[PDB]
mmCIF file of C-alpha atoms and ligand atoms in Angstrom:
data_model
loop_
_atom_site.group_PDB
_atom_site.id
_atom_site.type_symbol
_atom_site.label_atom_id
_atom_site.label_comp_id
_atom_site.label_asym_id
_atom_site.label_seq_id
_atom_site.Cartn_x
_atom_site.Cartn_y
_atom_site.Cartn_z
ATOM 1 C CA UNK R 1 0.113 -0.140 -0.141
ATOM 2 C CA UNK R 2 2.743 2.442 -1.086
ATOM 3 C CA UNK R 3 1.728 2.943 -4.874
ATOM 4 C CA UNK R 4 2.897 5.656 -6.747
ATOM 5 C CA UNK R 5 0.442 8.456 -6.679
ATOM 6 C CA UNK R 6 0.224 11.004 -9.693
ATOM 7 C CA UNK R 7 0.250 14.677 -8.242
ATOM 8 C CA UNK R 8 -1.976 16.475 -10.928
ATOM 9 C CA UNK R 9 -0.302 19.546 -13.114
ATOM 10 C CA UNK R 10 -1.810 22.088 -14.996
ATOM 11 C CA UNK R 11 -0.002 24.523 -16.853
ATOM 12 C CA UNK R 12 -0.666 28.277 -16.376
ATOM 13 C CA UNK R 13 -0.744 29.866 -19.926
ATOM 14 C CA UNK R 14 -1.280 34.032 -20.042
ATOM 15 C CA UNK R 15 -0.166 37.130 -20.514
ATOM 16 C CA UNK R 16 -0.210 37.963 -16.729
ATOM 17 C CA UNK R 17 3.672 37.365 -16.788
ATOM 18 C CA UNK R 18 3.436 40.671 -18.705
ATOM 19 C CA UNK R 19 2.083 42.214 -15.261
ATOM 20 C CA UNK R 20 4.407 44.917 -13.684
ATOM 21 C CA UNK R 21 5.054 42.322 -10.936
ATOM 22 C CA UNK R 22 5.861 39.604 -13.905
ATOM 23 C CA UNK R 23 2.879 37.765 -12.890
ATOM 24 C CA UNK R 24 3.261 37.443 -9.148
ATOM 25 C CA UNK R 25 0.048 38.331 -7.852
ATOM 26 C CA UNK R 26 -1.943 36.365 -10.601
ATOM 27 C CA UNK R 27 0.400 33.117 -9.883
ATOM 28 C CA UNK R 28 0.038 33.450 -6.166
ATOM 29 C CA UNK R 29 -3.777 33.442 -6.203
ATOM 30 C CA UNK R 30 -3.147 30.117 -8.890
ATOM 31 C CA UNK R 31 -0.733 28.444 -6.433
ATOM 32 C CA UNK R 32 -2.984 29.127 -3.437
ATOM 33 C CA UNK R 33 -6.221 27.822 -5.398
ATOM 34 C CA UNK R 34 -4.590 24.626 -6.623
ATOM 35 C CA UNK R 35 -2.677 23.960 -3.009
ATOM 36 C CA UNK R 36 -6.310 23.462 -1.844
ATOM 37 C CA UNK R 37 -6.988 20.412 -4.000
ATOM 38 C CA UNK R 38 -3.014 18.938 -4.537
ATOM 39 C CA UNK R 39 -2.545 20.271 -7.880
ATOM 40 C CA UNK R 40 0.546 21.535 -8.937
ATOM 41 C CA UNK R 41 0.820 24.739 -10.997
ATOM 42 C CA UNK R 42 3.409 25.044 -13.735
ATOM 43 C CA UNK R 43 3.937 28.455 -14.327
ATOM 44 C CA UNK R 44 5.938 30.105 -16.800
ATOM 45 C CA UNK R 45 8.601 31.897 -14.815
ATOM 46 C CA UNK R 46 9.481 29.358 -12.809
ATOM 47 C CA UNK R 47 13.080 28.397 -12.446
ATOM 48 C CA UNK R 48 13.405 30.991 -15.393
ATOM 49 C CA UNK R 49 16.567 30.722 -17.398
ATOM 50 C CA UNK R 50 18.380 33.590 -19.143
ATOM 51 C CA UNK R 51 17.964 32.212 -22.792
ATOM 52 C CA UNK R 52 14.903 32.856 -24.885
ATOM 53 C CA UNK R 53 15.129 29.182 -26.357
ATOM 54 C CA UNK R 54 15.863 27.718 -22.948
ATOM 55 C CA UNK R 55 12.762 29.711 -21.472
ATOM 56 C CA UNK R 56 10.766 28.188 -24.581
ATOM 57 C CA UNK R 57 11.928 24.686 -24.202
ATOM 58 C CA UNK R 58 11.075 24.493 -20.297
ATOM 59 C CA UNK R 59 7.399 25.989 -20.913
ATOM 60 C CA UNK R 60 7.080 23.343 -23.916
ATOM 61 C CA UNK R 61 8.117 20.652 -21.613
ATOM 62 C CA UNK R 62 5.537 21.909 -19.001
ATOM 63 C CA UNK R 63 2.758 21.313 -21.588
ATOM 64 C CA UNK R 64 3.894 17.665 -22.304
ATOM 65 C CA UNK R 65 4.254 17.319 -18.556
ATOM 66 C CA UNK R 66 0.574 18.452 -17.438
ATOM 67 C CA UNK R 67 -2.611 16.930 -17.410
ATOM 68 C CA UNK R 68 -4.335 20.148 -18.584
ATOM 69 C CA UNK R 69 -3.533 23.774 -19.438
ATOM 70 C CA UNK R 70 -5.980 26.559 -18.366
ATOM 71 C CA UNK R 71 -5.201 29.408 -20.509
ATOM 72 C CA UNK R 72 -5.810 33.091 -20.206
ATOM 73 C CA UNK R 73 -7.368 34.354 -23.457
ATOM 74 C CA UNK R 74 -8.268 37.687 -22.184
ATOM 75 C CA UNK R 75 -7.507 40.706 -24.581
ATOM 76 C CA UNK R 76 -4.270 41.645 -24.622
ATOM 77 C CA UNK R 77 -3.038 45.010 -26.030
ATOM 78 C CA UNK R 78 -6.604 45.296 -27.807
ATOM 79 C CA UNK R 79 -9.328 42.339 -28.708
ATOM 80 C CA UNK R 80 -7.125 39.859 -29.554
ATOM 81 C CA UNK R 81 -5.660 37.610 -26.986
ATOM 82 C CA UNK R 82 -2.161 36.886 -26.189
ATOM 83 C CA UNK R 83 0.048 35.138 -29.091
ATOM 84 C CA UNK R 84 2.148 33.523 -26.474
ATOM 85 C CA UNK R 85 -0.730 31.705 -24.667
ATOM 86 C CA UNK R 86 -1.903 31.198 -28.147
ATOM 87 C CA UNK R 87 1.090 29.159 -29.022
ATOM 88 C CA UNK R 88 0.879 26.857 -25.891
ATOM 89 C CA UNK R 89 -2.863 26.532 -26.496
ATOM 90 C CA UNK R 90 -1.650 25.124 -30.152
ATOM 91 C CA UNK R 91 1.389 22.967 -28.455
ATOM 92 C CA UNK R 92 -1.450 21.067 -25.742
ATOM 93 C CA UNK R 93 -4.139 20.754 -28.783
ATOM 94 C CA UNK R 94 -1.531 18.944 -31.039
ATOM 95 C CA UNK R 95 -0.521 16.758 -27.992
ATOM 96 C CA UNK R 96 -3.863 16.016 -27.097
ATOM 97 C CA UNK R 97 -4.223 17.610 -23.501
ATOM 98 C CA UNK R 98 -6.756 19.018 -22.250
ATOM 99 C CA UNK R 99 -7.369 22.354 -22.837
ATOM 100 C CA UNK R 100 -9.404 24.812 -20.633
ATOM 101 C CA UNK R 101 -9.615 28.388 -21.683
ATOM 102 C CA UNK R 102 -11.378 32.185 -19.788
ATOM 103 C CA UNK R 103 -11.483 35.311 -20.608
ATOM 104 C CA UNK R 104 -12.574 38.722 -19.017
ATOM 105 C CA UNK R 105 -14.810 39.806 -22.246
ATOM 106 C CA UNK R 106 -16.934 36.801 -23.870
ATOM 107 C CA UNK R 107 -18.592 38.683 -26.568
ATOM 108 C CA UNK R 108 -18.251 37.951 -30.051
ATOM 109 C CA UNK R 109 -15.331 39.269 -32.065
ATOM 110 C CA UNK R 110 -17.887 41.307 -34.183
ATOM 111 C CA UNK R 111 -19.250 42.581 -30.841
ATOM 112 C CA UNK R 112 -15.992 43.843 -29.767
ATOM 113 C CA UNK R 113 -14.903 45.429 -33.249
ATOM 114 C CA UNK R 114 -18.268 46.718 -33.260
ATOM 115 C CA UNK R 115 -18.467 45.538 -37.116
ATOM 116 C CA UNK R 116 -17.535 42.675 -39.506
ATOM 117 C CA UNK R 117 -14.443 44.568 -40.434
ATOM 118 C CA UNK R 118 -11.666 46.099 -38.104
ATOM 119 C CA UNK R 119 -10.474 49.758 -38.464
ATOM 120 C CA UNK R 120 -8.201 49.104 -41.565
ATOM 121 C CA UNK R 121 -10.816 47.103 -43.237
ATOM 122 C CA UNK R 122 -9.623 43.422 -42.025
ATOM 123 C CA UNK R 123 -12.389 40.864 -41.673
ATOM 124 C CA UNK R 124 -13.303 40.428 -38.328
ATOM 125 C CA UNK R 125 -14.602 36.463 -37.694
ATOM 126 C CA UNK R 126 -18.328 35.632 -37.755
ATOM 127 C CA UNK R 127 -18.470 31.993 -36.038
ATOM 128 C CA UNK R 128 -20.197 33.615 -32.604
ATOM 129 C CA UNK R 129 -17.107 33.369 -30.820
ATOM 130 C CA UNK R 130 -14.878 35.576 -28.615
ATOM 131 C CA UNK R 131 -11.599 34.982 -30.202
ATOM 132 C CA UNK R 132 -9.772 33.498 -33.349
ATOM 133 C CA UNK R 133 -11.762 30.326 -33.800
ATOM 134 C CA UNK R 134 -8.223 28.268 -33.677
ATOM 135 C CA UNK R 135 -8.497 28.655 -30.220
ATOM 136 C CA UNK R 136 -11.979 27.013 -29.608
ATOM 137 C CA UNK R 137 -11.967 23.136 -29.354
ATOM 138 C CA UNK R 138 -15.694 22.774 -28.069
ATOM 139 C CA UNK R 139 -14.843 23.076 -24.375
ATOM 140 C CA UNK R 140 -17.070 26.141 -22.798
ATOM 141 C CA UNK R 141 -15.436 29.372 -22.740
ATOM 142 C CA UNK R 142 -14.983 30.251 -18.859
ATOM 143 C CA UNK R 143 -15.308 33.652 -17.426
ATOM 144 C CA UNK R 144 -12.235 32.911 -14.643
ATOM 145 C CA UNK R 145 -9.400 30.764 -13.798
ATOM 146 C CA UNK R 146 -11.611 29.565 -10.954
ATOM 147 C CA UNK R 147 -14.232 28.574 -13.199
ATOM 148 C CA UNK R 148 -12.080 26.856 -15.574
ATOM 149 C CA UNK R 149 -10.363 25.194 -12.348
ATOM 150 C CA UNK R 150 -13.918 23.950 -11.429
ATOM 151 C CA UNK R 151 -14.295 21.963 -15.011
ATOM 152 C CA UNK R 152 -10.777 20.373 -14.411
ATOM 153 C CA UNK R 153 -11.867 19.236 -10.823
ATOM 154 C CA UNK R 154 -14.912 17.710 -12.583
ATOM 155 C CA UNK R 155 -13.421 16.004 -15.308
ATOM 156 C CA UNK R 156 -9.922 15.384 -14.159
ATOM 157 C CA UNK R 157 -10.271 13.211 -11.075
ATOM 158 C CA UNK R 158 -7.306 11.719 -8.991
ATOM 159 C CA UNK G 1 9.929 2.151 -61.616
ATOM 160 C CA UNK G 2 6.632 3.561 -60.358
ATOM 161 C CA UNK G 3 7.558 3.630 -56.621
ATOM 162 C CA UNK G 4 5.457 6.201 -54.853
ATOM 163 C CA UNK G 5 6.590 9.578 -54.895
ATOM 164 C CA UNK G 6 6.258 12.322 -51.803
ATOM 165 C CA UNK G 7 4.880 15.565 -53.055
ATOM 166 C CA UNK G 8 6.022 18.019 -50.517
ATOM 167 C CA UNK G 9 3.438 20.216 -48.399
ATOM 168 C CA UNK G 10 3.570 23.422 -47.031
ATOM 169 C CA UNK G 11 0.928 24.887 -44.626
ATOM 170 C CA UNK G 12 0.391 28.408 -45.471
ATOM 171 C CA UNK G 13 -0.092 29.994 -41.675
ATOM 172 C CA UNK G 14 -0.895 33.858 -41.615
ATOM 173 C CA UNK G 15 -3.626 36.605 -41.331
ATOM 174 C CA UNK G 16 -4.159 36.943 -45.266
ATOM 175 C CA UNK G 17 -7.521 35.062 -44.730
ATOM 176 C CA UNK G 18 -8.441 38.404 -43.116
ATOM 177 C CA UNK G 19 -7.852 40.606 -46.216
ATOM 178 C CA UNK G 20 -10.740 42.037 -47.925
ATOM 179 C CA UNK G 21 -10.023 39.317 -50.440
ATOM 180 C CA UNK G 22 -10.381 36.485 -47.965
ATOM 181 C CA UNK G 23 -6.407 36.024 -48.605
ATOM 182 C CA UNK G 24 -6.946 35.666 -52.583
ATOM 183 C CA UNK G 25 -4.112 37.957 -53.753
ATOM 184 C CA UNK G 26 -1.611 36.148 -50.993
ATOM 185 C CA UNK G 27 -2.692 32.626 -51.810
ATOM 186 C CA UNK G 28 -2.508 32.847 -55.373
ATOM 187 C CA UNK G 29 1.288 34.355 -55.265
ATOM 188 C CA UNK G 30 1.895 31.360 -52.735
ATOM 189 C CA UNK G 31 0.052 28.957 -54.985
ATOM 190 C CA UNK G 32 2.426 30.316 -58.299
ATOM 191 C CA UNK G 33 5.507 30.256 -56.197
ATOM 192 C CA UNK G 34 5.278 26.883 -55.087
ATOM 193 C CA UNK G 35 3.853 25.260 -58.484
ATOM 194 C CA UNK G 36 7.032 26.119 -59.946
ATOM 195 C CA UNK G 37 9.100 23.439 -57.345
ATOM 196 C CA UNK G 38 5.926 20.831 -57.278
ATOM 197 C CA UNK G 39 5.396 21.566 -53.725
ATOM 198 C CA UNK G 40 1.657 21.637 -52.793
ATOM 199 C CA UNK G 41 0.122 24.645 -50.510
ATOM 200 C CA UNK G 42 -1.891 23.585 -47.700
ATOM 201 C CA UNK G 43 -4.254 26.598 -47.365
ATOM 202 C CA UNK G 44 -6.629 27.551 -44.485
ATOM 203 C CA UNK G 45 -9.624 28.239 -46.510
ATOM 204 C CA UNK G 46 -9.122 25.347 -49.272
ATOM 205 C CA UNK G 47 -12.545 23.422 -48.960
ATOM 206 C CA UNK G 48 -13.559 25.503 -46.027
ATOM 207 C CA UNK G 49 -16.824 24.117 -44.009
ATOM 208 C CA UNK G 50 -19.134 26.383 -42.202
ATOM 209 C CA UNK G 51 -18.346 25.113 -38.869
ATOM 210 C CA UNK G 52 -15.555 26.455 -36.713
ATOM 211 C CA UNK G 53 -14.828 23.462 -35.180
ATOM 212 C CA UNK G 54 -14.547 21.501 -38.420
ATOM 213 C CA UNK G 55 -12.619 24.635 -39.967
ATOM 214 C CA UNK G 56 -10.230 24.056 -37.150
ATOM 215 C CA UNK G 57 -10.135 20.526 -37.152
ATOM 216 C CA UNK G 58 -9.032 20.434 -40.999
ATOM 217 C CA UNK G 59 -6.615 23.149 -40.291
ATOM 218 C CA UNK G 60 -4.822 21.044 -37.482
ATOM 219 C CA UNK G 61 -5.056 17.927 -39.887
ATOM 220 C CA UNK G 62 -2.914 20.143 -42.567
ATOM 221 C CA UNK G 63 -0.162 20.780 -40.210
ATOM 222 C CA UNK G 64 0.184 17.138 -39.276
ATOM 223 C CA UNK G 65 0.199 16.242 -42.998
ATOM 224 C CA UNK G 66 2.695 19.173 -43.914
ATOM 225 C CA UNK G 67 6.324 18.524 -44.320
ATOM 226 C CA UNK G 68 6.630 22.161 -43.110
ATOM 227 C CA UNK G 69 4.756 25.385 -41.871
ATOM 228 C CA UNK G 70 5.711 28.881 -43.356
ATOM 229 C CA UNK G 71 4.232 31.362 -40.884
ATOM 230 C CA UNK G 72 3.310 34.931 -41.417
ATOM 231 C CA UNK G 73 3.825 36.580 -37.998
ATOM 232 C CA UNK G 74 3.746 40.077 -39.289
ATOM 233 C CA UNK G 75 2.553 42.676 -37.275
ATOM 234 C CA UNK G 76 -1.560 41.880 -37.131
ATOM 235 C CA UNK G 77 -4.021 44.706 -35.539
ATOM 236 C CA UNK G 78 -0.652 46.345 -33.461
ATOM 237 C CA UNK G 79 2.802 45.184 -33.120
ATOM 238 C CA UNK G 80 1.639 41.407 -32.020
ATOM 239 C CA UNK G 81 1.507 38.596 -34.581
ATOM 240 C CA UNK G 82 -1.904 37.027 -35.388
ATOM 241 C CA UNK G 83 -3.114 34.571 -32.618
ATOM 242 C CA UNK G 84 -4.252 31.862 -35.099
ATOM 243 C CA UNK G 85 -1.029 31.809 -36.804
ATOM 244 C CA UNK G 86 0.609 31.746 -33.430
ATOM 245 C CA UNK G 87 -1.622 28.857 -32.520
ATOM 246 C CA UNK G 88 -0.816 26.919 -35.635
ATOM 247 C CA UNK G 89 3.124 27.616 -35.137
ATOM 248 C CA UNK G 90 2.600 25.831 -31.581
ATOM 249 C CA UNK G 91 0.651 23.029 -33.203
ATOM 250 C CA UNK G 92 3.568 22.774 -35.311
ATOM 251 C CA UNK G 93 6.279 22.888 -32.631
ATOM 252 C CA UNK G 94 4.760 19.899 -30.650
ATOM 253 C CA UNK G 95 4.243 17.965 -33.572
ATOM 254 C CA UNK G 96 8.310 18.427 -34.695
ATOM 255 C CA UNK G 97 7.489 19.966 -38.022
ATOM 256 C CA UNK G 98 9.945 22.366 -39.493
ATOM 257 C CA UNK G 99 8.609 25.760 -38.757
ATOM 258 C CA UNK G 100 9.655 28.876 -41.082
ATOM 259 C CA UNK G 101 8.718 32.144 -39.753
ATOM 260 C CA UNK G 102 8.603 35.687 -41.657
ATOM 261 C CA UNK G 103 7.498 39.152 -40.828
ATOM 262 C CA UNK G 104 7.196 42.437 -42.381
ATOM 263 C CA UNK G 105 8.949 44.239 -39.321
ATOM 264 C CA UNK G 106 11.954 42.365 -37.815
ATOM 265 C CA UNK G 107 12.819 45.116 -35.075
ATOM 266 C CA UNK G 108 13.120 44.013 -31.418
ATOM 267 C CA UNK G 109 10.007 44.139 -29.617
ATOM 268 C CA UNK G 110 11.105 47.041 -27.494
ATOM 269 C CA UNK G 111 12.204 49.135 -30.559
ATOM 270 C CA UNK G 112 8.692 48.527 -32.015
ATOM 271 C CA UNK G 113 6.984 49.599 -28.642
ATOM 272 C CA UNK G 114 9.688 52.132 -28.264
ATOM 273 C CA UNK G 115 10.124 51.008 -24.623
ATOM 274 C CA UNK G 116 10.220 48.136 -22.122
ATOM 275 C CA UNK G 117 6.565 48.784 -21.173
ATOM 276 C CA UNK G 118 3.517 49.403 -23.466
ATOM 277 C CA UNK G 119 0.901 52.234 -23.118
ATOM 278 C CA UNK G 120 -0.589 50.510 -20.154
ATOM 279 C CA UNK G 121 2.714 49.305 -18.172
ATOM 280 C CA UNK G 122 2.624 46.335 -19.570
ATOM 281 C CA UNK G 123 6.193 44.285 -20.039
ATOM 282 C CA UNK G 124 7.543 44.030 -23.316
ATOM 283 C CA UNK G 125 9.863 41.287 -23.727
ATOM 284 C CA UNK G 126 13.729 42.075 -23.915
ATOM 285 C CA UNK G 127 15.457 38.902 -25.966
ATOM 286 C CA UNK G 128 16.493 40.785 -29.195
ATOM 287 C CA UNK G 129 13.437 39.043 -30.745
ATOM 288 C CA UNK G 130 10.630 40.652 -32.782
ATOM 289 C CA UNK G 131 7.990 38.859 -31.318
ATOM 290 C CA UNK G 132 6.724 36.355 -28.362
ATOM 291 C CA UNK G 133 9.713 34.227 -27.451
ATOM 292 C CA UNK G 134 7.514 31.224 -27.762
ATOM 293 C CA UNK G 135 7.330 31.898 -31.494
ATOM 294 C CA UNK G 136 11.000 31.782 -32.057
ATOM 295 C CA UNK G 137 12.989 28.186 -32.403
ATOM 296 C CA UNK G 138 16.081 29.138 -33.376
ATOM 297 C CA UNK G 139 15.633 29.332 -37.174
ATOM 298 C CA UNK G 140 16.508 32.373 -38.602
ATOM 299 C CA UNK G 141 12.975 35.217 -38.867
ATOM 300 C CA UNK G 142 12.911 35.912 -42.620
ATOM 301 C CA UNK G 143 11.870 39.072 -44.475
ATOM 302 C CA UNK G 144 9.089 37.590 -46.694
ATOM 303 C CA UNK G 145 7.288 34.075 -47.571
ATOM 304 C CA UNK G 146 9.882 33.931 -50.624
ATOM 305 C CA UNK G 147 13.186 34.188 -48.432
ATOM 306 C CA UNK G 148 11.488 31.577 -46.003
ATOM 307 C CA UNK G 149 10.618 29.355 -49.024
ATOM 308 C CA UNK G 150 14.195 29.418 -50.119
ATOM 309 C CA UNK G 151 15.409 28.101 -46.863
ATOM 310 C CA UNK G 152 12.781 25.310 -47.036
ATOM 311 C CA UNK G 153 13.891 24.067 -50.583
ATOM 312 C CA UNK G 154 17.495 23.812 -49.178
ATOM 313 C CA UNK G 155 16.699 22.035 -46.277
ATOM 314 C CA UNK G 156 13.753 19.795 -47.420
ATOM 315 C CA UNK G 157 14.628 18.604 -50.802
ATOM 316 C CA UNK G 158 12.681 16.022 -52.885
HETATM 317 N N1 LIG D 201 6.629 34.798 -23.601
HETATM 318 C C1 LIG D 201 7.191 34.066 -22.856
HETATM 319 C C2 LIG D 201 6.681 32.704 -22.437
HETATM 320 C C3 LIG D 201 7.184 32.020 -21.502
HETATM 321 C C4 LIG D 201 7.795 32.970 -20.252
HETATM 322 C C5 LIG D 201 8.207 34.367 -20.573
HETATM 323 C C6 LIG D 201 8.758 34.984 -19.506
HETATM 324 N N2 LIG D 201 9.116 36.166 -19.731
HETATM 325 C C7 LIG D 201 8.688 36.675 -20.851
HETATM 326 C C8 LIG D 201 8.239 36.225 -21.665
HETATM 327 C C9 LIG D 201 7.713 34.697 -21.776
HETATM 328 N N1 LIG D 202 -9.000 31.614 -37.993
HETATM 329 C C1 LIG D 202 -9.246 31.125 -39.036
HETATM 330 C C2 LIG D 202 -8.402 29.827 -39.167
HETATM 331 C C3 LIG D 202 -8.654 29.190 -40.250
HETATM 332 C C4 LIG D 202 -9.428 29.289 -41.445
HETATM 333 C C5 LIG D 202 -10.459 30.703 -41.125
HETATM 334 C C6 LIG D 202 -10.760 30.737 -42.252
HETATM 335 N N2 LIG D 202 -11.956 32.175 -41.931
HETATM 336 C C7 LIG D 202 -11.613 32.893 -40.359
HETATM 337 C C8 LIG D 202 -10.689 32.454 -39.826
HETATM 338 C C9 LIG D 202 -10.092 31.308 -39.937
#
């Protein structure tokens, strides 16, 4: 009765890293929430290397090692989600990982831009989705990290 | 004779799809360039489905089927590349595909934003790269589709 026990792991994707505090406040909240459920956060800035390629490789490895990704696809520098987060969602999708997404703005892209085109006459997607359709996989788009985490707990038990 | 011959295939990732012509002018130029070298373009809008999930699945399948991705990481709706393209680059990276990227703007992110922070005091990466570090894998960032394609021809022969 001392079998190996898998500790669940979630990759914490999102532009919080670009906050003035490098994501400290966001990541601390994540750490506290996950601690209660014995889930390990895999955080992009953990044991951060100095070289871009090393940072990238470590983050890809975290995605490979995770049970799920919870991705913050909130508006970043406009109505579009963060590209880095989008890359990570793509990585996870290719590796058949559970991907859970949330955003602070759930309106359709055309509601966000107020038109079928942006200010430069570039087409805004019309699929009833809050962001680029590649980022949607059929799972509900959540309103917060917490709500996404509740789905994880219900659908990925120990 | 009459052994099976593999036709090389390149997934054409980029926000040209959002042009007023749905990328017609871009894709036509791509088709002509690749035709000369017996390379098949895998284009996001080819045989386009109506449902978001079907379009997504077909595009993921194209990446799975490709020999390389040439991704247009040009500024889209600001200094950041397109998120959908970023997702596709992520997918390709996880699948160990050759990923080739280009941009119309090769300046470092901090040169583009003119500061180490944006207008909202959000951190701009300082790794001497033109975009989010996740999008760089050690291969040169090219100036055009054509220059990326030249690398493909030199590094993925028939
Ligand atoms: N784009 C990025 C991905 C993963 C970690 C990072 C840490 N600092 C800046 C940018 C990052
Ligand atoms: N985001 C997208 C990915 C692949 C194909 C598309 C076609 N139209 C709009 C958006 C697309």
